[PDB]
């Protein structure tokens, strides 16, 4: 899907997590965040379309989503252990990683 769409999918699931009461709700929203991050990693922006995959511009674009996914996975470990409030605090920190991976390419 689009980059702006995956950005919206991440923002929608972050709100679900903030309002969640149990860990299964957080785990489901984080699961969809991980898929949207790996999907946005494929949505090379038009300004970078002709760059080689080995270019530093494509390293930066790709690895921003690697970093987001890494911490989504860490949040998923907290949700799988039933730590709702801790997983919600980790999800709140995902906002900064989301911005670092997407914002300057919109």
């Amino acid at each position: 899907a689009d980059l702006e769409d995956n950005w919206e999918t991440l923002n929608d699931n972050l709100k679900v997590i903030e309002k969640a009461d149990n860990a299964a709700q957080v785990k489901d929203a984080l699961t969809k965040m991980r898929a949207a991050a790996l999907d946005a990693q494929k949505a090379t922006p038009p300004k970078l379309e002709d760059k080689s995959p080995d270019s530093p511009e494509m390293w930066d674009f790709r690895h921003g989503f690697d970093h987001l996914v890494y911490h989504i996975d860490d949040a998923l470990k907290l949700a799988n252990e039933g730590k709702v409030k801790e997983a919600q605090a980790a999800a709140e920190q995902l906002k900064c990683h989301r911005n670092a991976a997407i914002q300057k390419y919109l």
Side-chain angles (χ1 to χ4, degrees), residues 1-3 5-106:
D2 212 288
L3 187 67
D5 294 347
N6 280 302
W7 161 273
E8 288 310 337
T9 303
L10 293 157
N11 295 342
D12 293 351
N13 281 286
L14 280 174
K15 247 163 277 186
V16 173
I17 291 162
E18 185 180 4
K19 299 167 186 300
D21 286 305
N22 61 74
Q25 296 171 318
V26 173
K27 186 249 184 59
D28 167 78
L30 286 168
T31 299
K32 296 151 143 204
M33 285 184 68
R34 193 191 201 277
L38 290 177
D39 195 72
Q41 192 179 48
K42 305 184 207 301
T44 310
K47 284 194 180 68
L48 301 192
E49 277 178 16
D50 293 344
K51 241 71 178 182
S52 83
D54 324 293
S55 68
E57 290 98 346
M58 287 307 296
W59 190 101
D60 193 357
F61 178 82
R62 284 194 62 79
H63 274 78
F65 299 99
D66 291 318
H67 196 200
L68 177 58
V69 165
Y70 178 97
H71 290 294
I72 288 169
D73 283 342
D74 268 358
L76 274 168
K77 288 181 218 145
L78 298 173
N80 288 324
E81 289 147 27
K83 303 183 190 163
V84 188
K85 93 170 196 287
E86 301 200 16
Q88 288 172 307
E92 169 71 11
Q93 279 163 100
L94 298 174
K95 278 165 170 186
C96 189
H97 301 311
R98 166 207 62 192
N99 298 345
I102 295 181
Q103 180 150 338
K104 76 182 151 302
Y105 304 110
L106 292 172

